[PDB]
């Protein structure tokens, strides 16, 4: 099927919708003017003084995703608010019930996710320029000096960078069942080049993001109500659910990019039964419906790994390894990001990433599992 993947931007939503139908200018204004409404303390009230708009005037997917994004950021700004510690352990029935309903139709859970605040949360400034940081901006933000532009867009520019490798994947599987060795070597080497060029994109996080800002401000807003003490037994979605419900916060863990290439190269991240594997399977529930699909479509295919090892073919192993290396490289570099942006900021606070994991030995499990797949 068509797995909602683009030749140019891969898993990212292509040319997203910036404006909702006029019926929803109530929603739109609260989200568009979020930095000032919590700077004041009128956000929770402006949301409480909102009547229940039904969802059935959102027609196409682009719209429903922008509504997800609007209803998403509002729900976070409400619950967390100033984010200086005072929380709302219950969500207003009037924002809850339409957001819980849109989330059920899209098969996503009712909380801001990677798909919303990165993949649907962008536009290009001058629509006849390339997809660089200068010529791009996010649609929605939480506060000022939250460095949410840098964070969300460097995240995106990696997704973009990976799209050139994802489009090669069908060549790999065709080459295997057509028994075309030269085609397959070229394909894996191409996927390799794209994945090692994506490491340079990661370097931009230092340029456009600020450690203390991310950690003390933006981290609090992308945070979830699942194993969070602040909201002991989840959040109450008044009207929709009889009890309160626990849902994990936003994470690049909800990125299909890194999981896609783990599955392709037969790196069994989602096997073994432990904490790291479990997190990575669970975060697929937070991926869009058609991406969740794409990943198990890749699991359904014959193993590139089993195929490559079946032959005494140095060049093919070298190419397969070059891919696995690229993935280690990125996860090795990503460990340095986390040290700079979470570990040290936390140590100057008189860990806990947005996802909710024992992150340092979680990442190194996931990093270790990757380099265990190196053939040689």
Annotated binding site for heme b: 334
Within 13 Å of residue 202, how many CA atoms lie on the same side as its CB?
19
Q: Is 250 in the site for ligand AOJ (CB under 6 A)?
A: yes
Query: 286 vs 362, which CB is nearer to ligand HEM?
Result: 362
Q: Is 10 in the site for ligand AOJ (CB under 6 A)?
A: no
In the complex, the smallest distance separating the C-beta of residue 198 from ligand HEM, rounded to whole angstroms, is 8
Binding range to ligand AOJ, per CB under 6 A, among 92-100, 187-195, 248-256, 274-282: 248-256
Return the one option of ligand AOJ, ligand HEM, none that residue 356 interacts with (CB less than 5 to 8 A, by type): ligand HEM
Separation of alpha carbons 25 and 17, rounded Å: 14
In the complex, the smallest distance separating the C-beta of residue 29 from ligand HEM, rounded to whole angstroms, is 30
Query: Cβ(162)–Cβ(255) under 8 Å?
Result: no
Q: Is 55 in the site for ligand AOJ (CB under 6 A)?
A: no
Q: Which residues bind ligand HEM (CB under 6 A)?
A: 154-155, 158, 205, 209, 214, 251-253, 255, 258, 331, 334, 337-338, 341-342, 353-357, 359, 362-363, 366
- 332 burial via Cβ count (<10 Å: 0-12, 13-18, 19+): middle
Chain mean position to CA 44: 26
In the complex, the smallest distance separating the C-beta of residue 365 from ligand HEM, rounded to whole angstroms, is 9
**DSSP conformation class of 237:** E
The first and second tokens of residue 285, run together, are 């529930």
Query: 87 vs 252, which CB is nearer to ligand AOJ?
Result: 252
Query: 277 vs 290, which CB is nearer to ligand HEM?
Result: 277
Binding range to ligand AOJ, per CB under 6 A, among 90-98, 113-121, 129-137, 178-186: 113-121
Separation of alpha carbons 136 and 65, rounded Å: 19
Query: 219 vs 292, which CB is nearer to ligand AOJ?
Result: 219
- 61 burial via Cβ count (<10 Å: 0-12, 13-18, 19+): middle
Q: Is 141 in the site for ligand AOJ (CB under 6 A)?
A: no
In the complex, the smallest distance separating the C-beta of residue 341 from ligand AOJ, rounded to whole angstroms, is 8
Separation of alpha carbons 347 and 360, rounded Å: 14
Q: Is 252 in the site for ligand AOJ (CB under 6 A)?
A: yes
Backbone dihedral angles phi then psi of residue 22, each to the nearest 5 degrees: -60, -30
**DSSP conformation class of 286:** G
Query: 148 vs 255, which CB is nearer to ligand HEM?
Result: 255
Residue whose pair of structure tokens reads 């790196």 in the numeric block: 267
Give the CA distances from residue 146 to residues 76, 143, 213, 250, 328, in Å, rounded to whole numbers and listed in that order.
14, 6, 6, 16, 30
**DSSP conformation class of 21:** -
Give the interface with ligand AOJ as residue ranges (CB under 6 A). 114, 117-118, 155, 219, 222, 250-253, 353-355
């Amino acid at each position: 099927k068509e797995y909602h993947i683009d030749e140019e931007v891969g898993f990212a939503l292509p040319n997203p919708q910036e404006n909702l139908p006029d019926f929803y200018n109530d929603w739109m204004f609260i989200a568009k003017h979020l930095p000032d409404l919590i700077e004041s303390g009128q956000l929770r009230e402006r949301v409480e003084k909102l009547n229940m708009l039904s969802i059935d005037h959102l027609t196409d997917h682009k719209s429903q995703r922008l509504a997800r994004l609007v209803l998403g950021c509002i729900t976070m700004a409400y619950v967390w608010g100033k984010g200086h510690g005072d929380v709302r352990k219950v969500l207003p029935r009037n924002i809850a019930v339409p957001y819980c309903q849109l989330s059920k139709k899209l098969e996503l859970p009712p909380i801001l996710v990677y798909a919303d605040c990165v993949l649907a949360n962008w536009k290009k400034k001058d629509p006849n320029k390339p997809l660089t940081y200068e010529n791009m901006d996010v649609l929605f933000s939480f506060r000022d000096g939250d460095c949410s532009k840098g964070f969300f867009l460097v995240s995106l520019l990696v997704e973009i960078a990976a799209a050139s490798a994802i489009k090669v994947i069908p060549t790999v599987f065709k080459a295997m069942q057509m028994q075309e060795r030269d085609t397959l070597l070229k394909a894996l080497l191409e996927i390799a080049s794209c994945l090692e060029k994506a490491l340079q994109v990661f370097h931009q996080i230092h340029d456009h993001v600020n450690p203390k800002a991310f950690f003390s401000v933006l981290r609090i807003y992308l945070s979830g109500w699942k194993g969070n003490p602040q909201l002991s037994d989840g959040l109450v979605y008044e009207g929709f659910w009889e009890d309160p419900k626990e849902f994990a916060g936003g994470s690049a863990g909800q990125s299909s990019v890194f999981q896609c290439f783990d599955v392709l190269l037969g790196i069994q991240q989602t096997a073994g039964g432990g904490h790291a594997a479990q997190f990575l399977q669970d975060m697929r529930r937070y991926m869009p419906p058609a991406h969740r699909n794409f990943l198990c479509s890749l699991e359904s295919n014959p193993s590139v790994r089993e195929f490559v090892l079946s032959k005494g073919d140095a060049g093919l192993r070298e190419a397969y390894d070059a891919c696995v290396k690229a993935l280690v490289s990125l996860r090795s570099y990503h460990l340095q990001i986390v040290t700079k942006y979470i570990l040290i900021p936390a140590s100057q606070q008189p860990a806990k990433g947005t996802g909710g994991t024992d992150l340092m030995n979680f990442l190194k499990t996931v990093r270790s599992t990757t380099e265990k797949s190196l053939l040689k």
